[PDB]
Amino acid sequence: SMGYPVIVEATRSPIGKRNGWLSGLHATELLGAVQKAVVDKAGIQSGLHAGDVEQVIGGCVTQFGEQSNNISRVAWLTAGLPEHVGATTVDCQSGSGQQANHLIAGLIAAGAIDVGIACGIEAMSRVGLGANAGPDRSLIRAQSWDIDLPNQFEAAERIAKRRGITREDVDVFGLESQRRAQRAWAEGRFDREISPIQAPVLDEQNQPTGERRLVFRDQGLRETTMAGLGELKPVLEGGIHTAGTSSQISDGAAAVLWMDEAVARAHGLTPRARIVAQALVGAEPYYHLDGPVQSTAKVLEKAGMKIGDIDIVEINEAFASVVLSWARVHEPDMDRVNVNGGAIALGHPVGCTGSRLITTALHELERTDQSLALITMCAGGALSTGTIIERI
Amino acid sequence: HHHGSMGYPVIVEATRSPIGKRNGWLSGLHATELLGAVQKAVVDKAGIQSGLHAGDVEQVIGGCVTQFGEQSNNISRVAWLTAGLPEHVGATTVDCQSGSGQQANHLIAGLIAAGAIDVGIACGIEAMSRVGLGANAGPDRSLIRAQSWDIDLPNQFEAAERIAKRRGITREDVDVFGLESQRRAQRAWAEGRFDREISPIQAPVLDEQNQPTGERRLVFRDQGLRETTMAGLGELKPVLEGGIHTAGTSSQISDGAAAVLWMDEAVARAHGLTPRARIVAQALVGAEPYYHLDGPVQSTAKVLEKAGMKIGDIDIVEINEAFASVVLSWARVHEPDMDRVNVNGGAIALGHPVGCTGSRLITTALHELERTDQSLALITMCAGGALSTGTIIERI
Ligand SMILES: CC(C)(COP(=O)(O)OP(=O)(O)OC[C@H]1O[C@@H](n2cnc3c(N)ncnc32)[C@H](O)[C@@H]1OP(=O)(O)O)[C@@H](O)C(=O)NCCC(=O)NCCS
Ligand SMILES: CC(C)(COP(=O)(O)OP(=O)(O)OC[C@H]1O[C@@H](n2cnc3c(N)ncnc32)[C@H](O)[C@@H]1OP(=O)(O)O)[C@@H](O)C(=O)NCCC(=O)NCCS
Ligand SMILES: C[C@H](C(=O)O)[C@H]1CC[C@H]2[C@@H]3CCC4=CC(=O)CC[C@]4(C)[C@H]3CC[C@]12C
Ligand SMILES: C[C@H](C(=O)O)[C@H]1CC[C@H]2[C@@H]3CCC4=CC(=O)CC[C@]4(C)[C@H]3CC[C@]12C
Ligand SMILES: [Cl-]
Ligand SMILES: [Cl-]
Ligand SMILES: [Cl-]
Ligand SMILES: [Cl-]
Ligand SMILES: [Cl-]
Ligand SMILES: [Cl-]
Ligand SMILES: [Cl-]
């Protein structure tokens, strides 16, 4: 009546740019394709079928329109998967896709389910940030609200000033994210984790042409130089972050298949990883997005580990300053941080990214035959998710 | 080869707001204030017997269906901050439609079982006066589904009628049930059965044009109760042309929140808090889309099977009264003693703030087990997207 949760499979779509390669897919189609993909992948060398999954939990931030009404469920049904499977959609802002994994692991630990999928979706081309708040944003908080909680761009600058991070510092970091992303793609590091996705071809306007083709690669990569980044214009007046040093607006989905260990064996699936420690903590509202400092501290503490014990770190590149702040505090070996690039180069479909990072981290641990990875993300509402996973 | 750092999740406290009618007693409260007040209330209730404080909570998980406007942007977190509670506590909001508030409890118990947290709050909120059903879908609802969608999934009112036809349920059948819901709720209230579980809430009063008067009042009663008779019910006009369900046999549109404080058993004891209940079995299953809301049949079956129990082993059942036919259909299949079903009334009389109800039902069931010195309760709810949540809880 108690479970031992392990990851048995993980996959993700390539990540499309805004109005890009995946923008012709209904949000429910994009998530549905990735849910089905993780099941199909597990099915190749086992007898596992979609009907064996008991619950799906998916992260999604802007739960409006195509992404409202429990997209995790609507996606499952839209993809033609079995109706008896339960589904829930969760929102802790950009932490959502990561928390989705924590939550599935918990249901397995409790003996509630033996097989579950944790996933994440965001189709930002079709449902943009703030679509869920309505036209008068003043209305979404109570009159009494008196917390200095800045928007994401102001946050990035407040964090930069807090650490003495310059335009030079962030441009250097943004260059390196593009370089590592390109290296990963040139070497084929993402081949295992990606499920290529069929998508409608768009004419030069954004109407479908009738064409439907496979999309293989992350669209956000582009040739980048220090000089080129230096010409970029800051999002805010007096700011240091530009499009070249901020996460991209993107479309994508990711899914991770979890099982109780003994049940994995019965299905003939190999346990690949487990959670050593997990957390979702609150951060300092003034800075808003400096929470990775706290979530990292918390999982290290729970695991009885130090930053040096970790082989691979995935810290979401919401903005360059978020990562540089975390680094100044935790003093990691940066050769171990976002080794295949991050959201500055690869994109950040907000509700997807948490599951995407767990997927990317696991595959990098396997590629290099290493053991421990830390995943940490800043999140809206001054929150941060953290996970330490270990290979089995 | 390995074993674990696990928790044993138990409920230590549970409370709910009174449930207001649409544009009613609670309609003047911002949704974040209504939830925040109940979050704070469940923490305060524990603090009486202990040194537990809000900062000791590690995570909050809250259910909410229509996550638009006041209810968007992770209302669980916004509510916590708005009520002045400590910033370091994490929060997540969840959506499995009407199942949300119940699944919130399942998920907190999961995090404790996994050893992720020692202290958590499961909750639910819906301010339907301020954020109505469908506000999250946008102007044209055909857009929220892919062109390929070809599933015969009906709206909730069509579902209630399909379920009636599935079981041969008549207008008389549902009217008898609706009457009994009002009668049981009125008896429960008259006897003060709900006094323990209710946290009174201060609410700005709104006039008839829904504008504030400046007056604030303490709300402590469920607003949905009203004098009901078989003759009165028989006069009501069905919601759908040729249907059997009316306002008198359907759940009410309502405002409310509820919250349950969970801990690892050992941590509960360390704080001098008595463990009050645990989950025997929990589930969230998919239901048949054609009928949509008949899923309590399946979720009940699943938890009974996992628990190794029969319906006859259950002392108290809370099955959400989304529509009379949902409950009567479930009863026709599972054959419960109806004297044990919704003993203090249900959503037809008490109201149904959709995201709140799952937590509300656990709160109500626990308190009734305690009141009658009984052991086992089943909670089961139908949900949009053809889903259903089930829980068997047992007193400790
Ligand atoms: C930063 C942001 C505002 C940029 O939006 P954008 O201006 O539409 O982005 P673009 O792709 O058009 O890039 C702008 C310009 O920079 C250029 N550029 C972008 N990346 C470049 C690179 N690596 N090298 C050289 N030039 C680059 C573009 O070519 C473009 O050039 P232009 O002068 O011809 O317009 C947008 O990405 C954003 O909002 N990101 C964050 C989203 C978010 O908040 N997520 C949540 C996190 S907390
Ligand atoms: C059923 C429903 C449509 C009724 O809405 P409504 O008509 O605005 O509700 P009202 O309170 O105004 O009641 C309607 C009438 O019935 C009467 N009525 C209600 N309960 C009564 C009772 N117990 N005895 C006698 N009359 C009653 C009212 O007085 C009213 O009279 P009137 O219309 O002639 O003025 C509405 O409650 C509803 O949509 N419920 C479901 C919401 C939902 O979908 N939840 C999710 C479920 S899956
Ligand atoms: C998903 C992101 C994350 O968690 O990384 C979070 C972080 C900061 C969040 C914004 C804060 C300001 C704001 C005020 C409104 O009234 C509407 C919603 C927005 C635009 C917010 C949208 C979500 C954001 C981008
Ligand atoms: C919360 C309820 C529950 O879980 O009991 C569910 C049950 C049926 C759901 C409706 C189905 C039809 C529909 C079509 C749309 O285009 C927009 C959304 C609505 C209005 C749905 C809103 C939520 C409802 C009422
Ligand atoms: Cl099946
Ligand atoms: Cl603010
Ligand atoms: Cl750097
Ligand atoms: Cl192709
Ligand atoms: Cl480059
Ligand atoms: Cl306190
Ligand atoms: Cl009649």
Distances (CA, A) of A213 to A15, A116, A200, A201, B292: 15, 30, 7, 7, 35
- State the greatest distance between any 2 C-alpha atoms of chain B, in Å, as a whole number: 68
Q: What superfamily would CATH give domain A1-392?
A: Thiolase/Chalcone synthase (3.40.47.10)
Phi and psi at residue B84, in whole multiples of 5°?
85, 15
Q: How far apart (Å, rounded) are the C-alpha atoms in residues A323 and A176?
A: 12
Alpha-carbon distance A362 to A377, whole Å?
16
CA nearest to A255, candidates A125, A65, A60: A60
Q: How far is the C-alpha of B226 from the C-alpha of A238, rounded, in Å? A: 62
Name A212's Cβ contacts closer than 8 Å, sequence gap at least 6.
A198, A199, A200, A201
| CB neighbour class for B147 (10 Å; exposed up to 12, middle 13-18, buried from 19) | exposed
Q: What are the structure tokens assigned to A295, written together?
A: 């979530």
Report whether B361 contacts B98 (CB < 8 A): no
Q: Give residue A156's identity as a one-letter amino acid code.
A: A
Find tokens 């129990």 and name the residue: B309
Q: Which residues contact B112 (CB under 8 A, 6 or more apart)?
A: A106, B7, B8, B9, B118, B120, B262, B263, B264
Buried b (16+ CB within 10 A) or exposed e, A322-350: bbbbbbebbebeeebbbbbbbbbbbbbbb
Q: Are strands B119-127 and B59-63 parallel, antiparallel or unpaired?
A: parallel
Distance CA A21, CA A197 (A): 10
Q: How far apart are CA B80 and CA A235, in angstroms?
A: 31
**Nearest residue to A297 (alpha-carbon basis) of A324, A261, A264, A330:** A330
Pairwise CA distance, residues B47 & B384, whole Å: 37
CB atoms within 10 A of CB A271: 18
Contact A215, A22 (CB under 8 A): yes
The CA distance from B89 to A142, in Å, is 20
**Is the shortest distance between the CB of A41 and ligand 1 below 6 Å?**
no
Of A247, A319, A348, A376, which is best to mutate to test ligand 1, by the most ligand atoms within 8 angstroms of its C-beta? Answer: A247
Show the DSSP H helices in chain A as ranges.
27-43, 71-78, 96-109, 152-163, 167-187, 226-230, 261-267, 292-303, 320-330, 343-346, 350-368
Show residues of chain A in contact with B89, CB under 8 Å.
Answer: 281-282
Minimal CA separation from B188 to chain A, in Å: 33
Q: Which of B70, B96, B288 is opposite residue A88, by nearest beta carbon?
A: B96
How far is the CA of A337 from the CAs of A75, A247, A387, B270, in angstroms? 33, 16, 15, 40
Min Cα–Cα distance to chain A from B236, Å = 31
Report d(CA B65, CA B93) in Å as an integer: 10
Task: Answer positive or negative: Cα dihedral of A18, A21, A26, A30.
Answer: negative
Neighbours of B189 (CB within 10 A): 18
Reading the block at residue B81, the tokens are 């901050």
Q: Is A117 helix (H, G, I), strand (E, B) or coil?
A: strand
Q: Are strands A250-260 and A115-123 parallel, antiparallel or unpaired?
A: antiparallel
What amino acid is encoded at A281 in this protein?
V
Classify residue A187 as exposed, middle or buried by CB count within 10 Å of its CB (0-12, 13-18, 19+).
exposed
Query: Contact A281/B81, CB-based, under 8 Å?
Result: no
Work out whether strand A55-59 and strand A208-215 pair parallel, antiparallel, or are unpaired: unpaired
Least Cα separation, residue A180 to chain B (angstroms): 32
**For residue B287, how far is the Cα from the chain centroid?**
19
Of A149, A152, A235, A248, the residue with max ligand 3 atoms within 8 A of its CB, to mutate for a pocket test, comes to A152
The SS3 assignment for A246 reads: strand
Q: How far apart are CA A366 and CA B394, in angstroms?
A: 44
In this structure, the residue with its CA closest to atom 21 of ligand 1 is: A244
Beta A55-59 vs A115-123: how paired, if at all?
parallel
Assigned token pair, A175: 């260059």
Vertex A53: Cα angle to B158 and B66 (nearest 5): 40
With beta carbons less than 8 A apart as the criterion, state whether A122 and A62 touch.
yes
Choose among A334, A391, A392, A381: nearest CA to A99.
A381
First-to-final CA distance of chain B = 32
Q: Return d(Cα B110, Cα B27) in angstroms, integer.
A: 33
Contact A381 B91 (CB under 8 A): yes
Residue type, A387: T
Q: Which of B251, B330, B388, B389 to mutate to test the pocket of ligand 2 (most atoms within 8 A of CB)?
A: B251
**A281·B90 Cβ contact <8 A:** yes
CB atoms inside a 10 Å sphere around CB A230: 12
What CATH superfamily is the domain B1-396? Thiolase/Chalcone synthase (3.40.47.10)
Q: Report resolution in angstroms.
A: 1.7
> Where on the phi/psi map is residue A15: left (φ > 0), alpha (ψ -120 to 50), or beta?
beta
Indicate the burial class of B215 (C-beta count within 10 angstroms; 0-12, 13-18, 19 or more).
exposed
Taking the C-alpha atoms of residue B42 and residue A227, their distance in angstroms, rounded to an integer, is: 57
Rounded distance, CA B181 to CA B222, Å?
A: 14
**Tokens 């301010």 -> residue:** B127
How far is CA B134 from its chain centroid?
A: 19
Q: Ligand 2 — pocket residues by CB below 6 A? A: B 98, 156, 182, 226, 228, 232-233, 236, 239, 247-248, 250-253, 293, 322, 352, 354
Q: Which residues contact B26 (CB under 8 A, 6 or more apart)?
A: B17, B18, B20, B34, B127, B129, B201, B203, B219, B255, B256
d(CA B67, CA A305): 38
Q: Which residues surround ligand 5, an ion (CB under 5 A)?
A: A 51, 82
Per-residue b or e along B190-208, where b marks 16 or more CB atoms closer than 10 Å to that residue's CB: eeebbeebbbebebbebee
Give the domain ranges of chain B.
Answer: 1-396
First to last CA, chain A: 22
